[PDB]
Amino acid sequence: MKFDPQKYRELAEKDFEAAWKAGKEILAERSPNELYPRVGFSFGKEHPLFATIQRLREAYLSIGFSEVVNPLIVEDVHVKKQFGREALAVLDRCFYLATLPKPNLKPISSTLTLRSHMTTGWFITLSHIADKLPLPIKLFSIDRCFRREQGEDATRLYTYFSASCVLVDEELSVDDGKAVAEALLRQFGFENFRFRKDEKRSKYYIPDTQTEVFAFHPKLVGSSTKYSDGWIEIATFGIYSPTALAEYDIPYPVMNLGLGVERLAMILYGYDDVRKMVYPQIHGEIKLSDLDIAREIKVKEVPQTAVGLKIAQSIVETAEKHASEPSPCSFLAFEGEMMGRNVRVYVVEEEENTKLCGPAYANEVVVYKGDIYGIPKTKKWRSFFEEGVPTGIRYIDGFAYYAARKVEEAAMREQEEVKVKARIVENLSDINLYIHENVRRYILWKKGKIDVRGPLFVTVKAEIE
Amino acid sequence: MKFDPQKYRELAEKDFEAAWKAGKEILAERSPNELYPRVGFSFGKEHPLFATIQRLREAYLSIGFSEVVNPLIVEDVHVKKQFGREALAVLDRCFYLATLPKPNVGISAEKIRQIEAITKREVDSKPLQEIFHRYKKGEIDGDDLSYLIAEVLDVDDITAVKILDEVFPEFKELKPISSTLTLRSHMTTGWFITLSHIADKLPLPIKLFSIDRCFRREQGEDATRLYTYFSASCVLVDEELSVDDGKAVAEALLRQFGFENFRFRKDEKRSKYYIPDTQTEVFAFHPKLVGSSTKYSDGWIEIATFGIYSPTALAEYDIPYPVMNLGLGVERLAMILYGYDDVRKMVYPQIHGEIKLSDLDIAREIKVKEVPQTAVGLKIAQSIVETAEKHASEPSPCSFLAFEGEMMGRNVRVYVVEEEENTKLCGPAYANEVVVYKGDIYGIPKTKKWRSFFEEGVPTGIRYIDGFAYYAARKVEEAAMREQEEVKVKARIVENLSDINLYIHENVRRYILWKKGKIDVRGPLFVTVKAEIE
Amino acid sequence: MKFDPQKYRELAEKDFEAAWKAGKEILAERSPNELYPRVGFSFGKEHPLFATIQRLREAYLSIGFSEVVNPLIVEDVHVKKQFGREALAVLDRCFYLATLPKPNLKPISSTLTLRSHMTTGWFITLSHIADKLPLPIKLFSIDRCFRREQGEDATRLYTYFSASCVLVDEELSVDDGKAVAEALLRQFGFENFRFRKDEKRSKYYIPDTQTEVFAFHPKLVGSSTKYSDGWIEIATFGIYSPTALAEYDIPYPVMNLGLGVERLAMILYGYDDVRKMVYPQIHGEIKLSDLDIAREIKVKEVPQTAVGLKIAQSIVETAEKHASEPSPCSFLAFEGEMMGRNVRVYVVEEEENTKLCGPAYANEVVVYKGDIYGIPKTKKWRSFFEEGVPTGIRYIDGFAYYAARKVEEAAMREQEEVKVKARIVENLSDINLYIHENVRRYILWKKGKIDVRGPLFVTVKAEIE
RNA sequence: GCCAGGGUGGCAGAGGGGCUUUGCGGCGGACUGCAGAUCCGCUUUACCCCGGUUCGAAUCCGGGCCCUGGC
DSSP states (O other): OOOOHHHHHHHHHHOHHHHHHHGGGGSOOOOGGGSTTSSOOOOOOOOHHHHHHHHHHHHHHHTTOEEOOOOOEEETHHHHHHHGGGHHHHHTTSOEEEEOOOOOOOOEEEEEEEOSSTHHHHHHHHHTTTTTSOSOEEEEEEEEEEOOSTTOSSSOOSEEEEEEEEEEOSSOOHHHHHHHHHHHHHTTTOOEEEEEEOTTOOTTBOTTOOEEEEEEOGGGTTOSSGGGGSEEEEEEEEEBOHHHHHTTTOOSOEEEEEEEHHHHHHHHHTOSOHHHHHOTTTTTOOOOOHHHHHHTOEESSOOSSHHHHHHHHHHHHHHHHHSSSBSSEEEEEEEEEETTEEEEEEEEEOSSSSBSSOTTTTOEEEEETTEEEEEOOOGGGHHHHHHSEEEEEEHHHHHHHHHHHHHHHHHTTTOSEEEEEEEEEOSSGGGTEEOOHHHHHHHHHTTOOEEOOEEEEEEEEEEEO | OOOOHHHHHHHHTTOHHHHHHHGGGGSOOOOGGGSTTSSOOOOOOOOHHHHHHHHHHHHHHHTTOEEOOOOOEEETHHHHHHHGGGHHHHHTTSOEEEEOOOOOTTGGGTTTTTTSOOOOSSOOOSOOTTTTTHHHHSOOSGGGTTTTTTSSSOSGGGSHHHHHHTTOTTTTTOOOEEEEEEEOSSHHHHHHHHHHTTTTTSOSSEEEEEEEEEEOOOTTOSSSOOSEEEEEEEEEEOSSOOHHHHHHHHHHHHGGGTOOEEEEEEOTTOOTTBOTTTOEEEEEEEEEEETOSSSOTEEEEEEEEEEEBOHHHHHTTTOOSOEEEEEEEHHHHHHHHTTOSOHHHHHOTTTTTOOOOOHHHHHHHOEESSOOSSHHHHHHHHHHHHHHHHSSSOBSSEEEEEEEEESSSSEEEEEEEEOSSSSBSSOTTTTOEEEEETTEEEEEOOOGGGHHHHHHSEEEEEEHHHHHHHHHHHHHHHHTTTTOSEEEEEEEEEOSGGGGTEEOOHHHHHHHHHTTOOEEOOEEEEEEEEEEEO | OOOOHHHHHHHHHHOHHHHHHHGGGGSOOOOGGGSTTSSOOOOOOOOHHHHHHHHHHHHHHHTTOEEOOOOOEEETHHHHHHHGGGHHHHHTTSOEEEEOOOOOOOOEEEEEEEOSSTHHHHHHHHHTTTTTSOSOEEEEEEEEEEOOSTTOSSSOOSEEEEEEEEEEOSSOOHHHHHHHHHHHHHTTTOOEEEEEEOTTOOTTBOTTOOEEEEEEOGGGTTOSSGGGGSEEEEEEEEEBOHHHHHTTTOOSOEEEEEEEHHHHHHHHHTOSOHHHHHOTTTTTOOOOOHHHHHHTOEESSOOSSHHHHHHHHHHHHHHHHHSSSBSSEEEEEEEEEETTEEEEEEEEEOSSSSBSSOTTTTOEEEEETTEEEEEOOOGGGHHHHHHSEEEEEEHHHHHHHHHHHHHHHHHTTTOSEEEEEEEEEOSSGGGTEEOOHHHHHHHHHTTOOEEOOEEEEEEEEEEEO
């Protein structure tokens, strides 16, 4: 609450310590569902694929390449100009575009295709500048490509991102490609590199320049994979063939290096399955932290008056010191007024030979590894309390709040007495607690469990006058 | 090299394979020092501290706080308006700003000055008692290129610097004089000031942050603490606030840095600028810390602290609303994120001897000293290695024509030979390769004995004969200039890189020494090359 | 509200158009203060100084320099080692550190100082590596420095940021410094550069290498300053003198370039005064957009029942079609029930020879240039309505809501009739609208004005039974 | 912060009022040697800082730091 500086100013002139202690007066008195962890801030989380793409942009810029957007939709003649004879074979892996013929049904294929690698687009782009800009020209682009690889999914996806670059200069060799790979890859934590000639020898690359790049990453040593030794194939490059360059009037050699983004991201963020990584929602990988679930556990009925609160608070108070006493037995917890009349609240047990409260009255609700537990703070359960996240709500706590608001309803109901007792807890409900239907569906989906049980056996009585 | 597009188009349209194969002509033939890993690209690295700060900026922004710059230099009265009597304990941990006073070329040093022969060094000029009085008025540092360059003649500080020393030992006396100005020991000292100008003129709630420097002495040591540090701080101003707002903020912030669980305890200090019982310490759990050798084996560490400003203190600046303040020590977070155990090594690696090159870096630094300056010379070298590889077992004596051709318009024939008898053309270590492994440079042969090195280190791709061959070719190449006719160069026992025509820049050599690394490049090369140039 | 897919599924199988139109049923019915622009999202805004610092880090990394942290607190002997004789003069501009002597008051100066430029720290840092790392060594650091320049503030501040770098190599010249400046500055939009020898010729730089850099920025041409021609002094560099390098055992020349951050930021974000830029709160530069202020304008009393709303809504409805009718005159606006009994709401005027509503009943509240206006939608005021931000709340709108909640209070009060009328509007209050005390203090501070006036003259009567 | 043993050259490790180890390492040179060695020459006379004792202290005494077996 807002306060007056003068008061505290002079009030502190008289007695500092008193002024200081007086300060608690400005603090807000929070009710159940407004207490941590039930209250919190949220924020967006980025996706591993796009984070990686952004890291790659930075890395290329770090070594001098300028960004470009290459043609994505292209006439199949371009693949013909680039692969030569081997072109028919290549086009098999591509997708062609088809359009519905404007009915004055059946789509009609055109001669347009989606690029299968960035290269199809690089030649077009280079044709307009390779002879008009100072050398060397260093361009890069991280964008989508489409491929019909076998037409499966267990091995590959239809669309993927290629983090690609081209280097145009008068004198080039396979060494420029090795230098670029190391400089790019070192920025991602790779420490050692090995290169081997790629057996396929594609016709758009000068014979024997097509190289496969292997890099070593410590993060992968001891990995539950064949990448256990730390090495993995991560990119490929080659020097474009004059046969292809010539079909675009490019007169200089061109070093092209391409790296598959999905694989890098998997390594950086620890994924084993590409699809689980880029499409987690679609592949049931949703996930909430224990702290998240704990925040969703709320008190259903809460006292609506400042009086109600201090009542539930008192109910709890006396049960924390007389849950032992033999029954029958009775105690007065609260005495005062609300809504216009005084009231007396009693914590009791009518049954013979037993204790006031059940042995589980002090059990606390705590989340651990996706499960919700109702347990006692015993050495037996320590690990749950220290590594999970306790709600700070006990069995009585949840009940008292219900009790209070219940007499509070009697007061406004014109009654004069109310009976509210609790016996055996079987779920969150029995303890005046709930979670939104979506979180419940979540926990089932994740095959989690809710174990909130126990002998509460606690009764409260009150008489309003 | 460049090529002709039209030519390639027309040859490719008819005979594709021929054109494709011919493409190799446009590639560059690289000399030894132009080959990977000897050539490379570089890039700058980020310092862990500043990296963390930028991430913290992004994290505070993502949760709705706006950036601010708070006062850093402040009168110590603010620590008093904020702590009350406890202030003295605080100020004893702070630094005060002291400054140097101006010297007096009068009164103090003039009654006993004009009572003696002032200056002799002839520069005479009229009494600049004024141009020297203005020094008690308003001056600076570069003002020296004034009362000299445009006074008693003499451009710049040629005689300006020295005229001072041997004429007025008065400047050499000066001693700094403290003031009441202090350097904030935590962001809080400055938040109050900043908040006094807006807590009541901006829409509530007000969410501001600042990640900046603070200063705080500690036992006068470095291994016990640092004099300056960064605090990633924030303030929340609203009508209703409780410790829960501090918790919610700590979690929303820390969760973005990989922490997953939090615990809060009351701070025994119970500092006066905070409402009693609100000063909380925050402990967080981070995976990277579990199983760690550190004192945080279980993954828990105290990462921040927060509280709610005492209305007693808010009043001193006329702030009418409660405010929550959370501070995070940046250095510690950086250590966790980038894996460091010692603050000092983390932020001051260069000064604390923590410099490092990777094996790959060292390999790149191993170059070939002597290299043929001719395209034919390179061919000559290539052929030497070639014939040396073909007839390395031929019993002694023996001889082989390695290369026959023209160089400088003077026919040449180079031979690989072995004079001595009872041995072979090439020594046993002729095919040894130079490889960098765990900081050392080794001259070794590919033997099951050294798999580890060739597999986990970085091969330079250069062998004893390769290095020697380049040396030789350059030699004959030189003779072919001295108008010579017969050249002979030999290699016997190898002691170091030098004996292989290999070298490393002097800084790299020192790095290796400093890191207690070694260079073991030895072995029996015993290879000879003879040339006849006409 | 949550709905059932099956219903809409089959319901759409019967008649799509009907299903579609039925969709409006799931939308939320928003009450006054929950309507745009009264509801919104916020987000953090970064400060120009720190944004610039971050752009500078990127720019240095873009050209190959690695980040470093240099010593900030230093023994004054280092300035002595670096400036030689000219050192006494330099120390005058520095700050020394003093500590309170632990009383078993008066601070005692030590021999420690704060660096006045990054250079004081570079030498220390370079001493440990210039002879142990491959050349060239390219380091940079953007951090704080302290200076007692004249001891004023109208010209300079005590602390500032230096965006600095060093380049260590065997062969260097003043040309390396020019190359670095252009590469760094081009990334900030500067297009042309001129260099002139700095007259001061500091002793830590090789004589005649200390250079001043001038750069041209189009953003500054036509600027209300002498920077009108587009040029401005933006940085300085030089090659460290062997005299100084030698005191640290550094055997190679070193190119050092430093650029003052505050000036760059001012240019990038358009500021004329350094202090107004880095300390806007302290120099009264707080600022809220019109849209922000509009959002803070809320309806004080709002009908608490769905019935109350449709009532206020109806009051408004009939006044929009009978504000003309001559008075005395009366109309029935609503008839139905709430809280347990039927009610009839009347919009009327008892006075003779006049109109039902005042001529200002339809005036709208709109914010423009920091001022709040109550005006009619007339060609005369068009520019205000098209360039400012209207609240969407008119004079009647604000009143009706009050009327409604007022009968709503009579219903629960057991009454049977209520009189609520409005005459002359003099402020936001008279129209059932308010703004939080801090926004009001804001508007006064910014010397803004509130002009909400006019003849409302509208009366409402109702009788609950 | 309270008990105790101590702080030596690049690394290692003896010793103990002035002369004084030593080993590794390293650097320069020599060697008819076909494998990772041989011989000669080599330092910055090394023992934290402030006082005290003394003709003289690294070695004796007091204090300030720094490492360790301890609460």
